Structure 1
């Protein structure tokens, strides 16, 4: 007995039922498959960050003077206009009281 050899008939329908989910993209991708001369050097640069720590925070505290230096030195109808003003209930808390007294 012979049989059908191959098809891809119901497969488009099958793929889309649970939907085609794109790869889980993030910030901070892994450094696997990066040049291991470049990678070992990048690891030494990370290891030797605390050696130049005193200049980092000292420059940041001198540059934080540069903020305080300059931040203190820094310092359609006329009727529908009126009725949209009167009707809304913090701007027009006294215009309604004037209206309310104006029945007498």
Structure 2
């Protein structure tokens, strides 16, 4: 009573019925597996980002006000070109009006 030992004959056809899909690419991947010392210090940086908030708006509102003084310192043939202009429903409206007023 000997039986078949091992094969992968139909396996490559079974894999492609629902497809071989890559893992779900998301922005902001998890920080799980990152080393504990740098992960601990990053949490301390996030804990005190709110400390210099009133100094941060004093720079970003300064930049937004300086944006005003930055931006206000600066502040195939002629036949087929004519016929495609007349055939325009909006641009050739007065040209079609001229043609309709050409036969009276």
Aligning the two structures, in what range does the TM-score lie when normalised by the shorter sequence? over 0.9
Q: Alpha-carbon deviation of 1:33?
A: 0.7
Query: TM-score, normalization: structure 2?
Result: 0.96
| Structure 2, unaligned runs of 5 or more | none
Deviation (angstroms), 1:73: 2.0
Q: For residues 53-93 of structure 1, what are the alpha-carbon distances to aligned partners after superposition, in whole Å with 9 as ceiling and x for unaligned?
A: 11101100111122101222222111101000001111111
Deviations 1:30-68 (A, max 9, x none): 111101000000000000111111110110011112210
Q: For this pair of structures, how many residues does the alignment match?
A: 104
What are the ranges of 5 or more consecutive residues in structure 1 without an aligned counterpart?
A: none
TM-score by length of 1: 0.96
Query: Which runs of 4 or more aligned residues in structure 1 lie more than 6 Å from their structure 2 counterparts after TM superposition?
Result: none
Cα-Cα RMSD: 0.8
